[PDB]
């Protein structure tokens, strides 16, 4: 029979030379990390304006107006360093000491961006 922002003092921003720092993530979530400038708004999607670059692992995209495949998704318990070059407005991402690769085979992320008031690093 309701994500959060994190960012560092506006007066430590930068206009010039080169800058690095580590962003650690024990967990393979929704996170998002980069730079922003000292206007970015601390309600709105990290990167999605102008005032902000950022990247997502969560699924590979570069943050900006819009989202642009980039890299490779982080796992629990990776370790993300960014760099920043002023003289040349270069935007780089490694991901555990990987230089992260775009679809063109660029290392680069982002180009051609104004310094205006600086940046500063950011995550969400």
């Given amino acids: 029979?309701?994500?959060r922002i994190f960012?560092?003092?506006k007066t430590y921003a930068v206009k010039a030379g080169r800058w690095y720092f580590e962003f650690e993530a024990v967990t393979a979530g929704d996170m998002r990390v980069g730079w922003s400038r000292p206007g970015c708004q601390p309600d709105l999607e990290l990167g999605s304006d102008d005032r902000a670059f950022?990247?997502?692992?969560?699924?590979?995209?570069?943050?900006?107006?819009?989202?642009?495949?980039?890299?490779?998704?982080?796992?629990?318990?990776?370790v993300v360093g960014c760099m920043v070059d002023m003289n040349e407005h270069?935007?780089?991402?490694?991901?555990n000491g990987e230089i992260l690769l775009d679809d063109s085979g660029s290392?680069?992320?982002?180009?051609?961006?104004?310094?205006?008031?600086?940046?500063?690093?950011?995550?969400?």
């Fill in 90 to 95: 270069t935007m780089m991402f490694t991901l």
């Fill in 7 to 9: 960012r560092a003092e």
């Fill in 54 to 78: 950022a990247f997502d692992g969560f699924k590979a995209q570069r943050w900006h107006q819009g989202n642009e495949h980039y890299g490779r998704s982080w796992q629990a318990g990776d």
């Fill in 107 to 124: 290392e680069l992320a982002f180009k051609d961006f104004d310094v205006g008031d600086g940046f500063i690093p950011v995550c969400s």
């Fill in 1 to 3: 029979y309701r994500f």
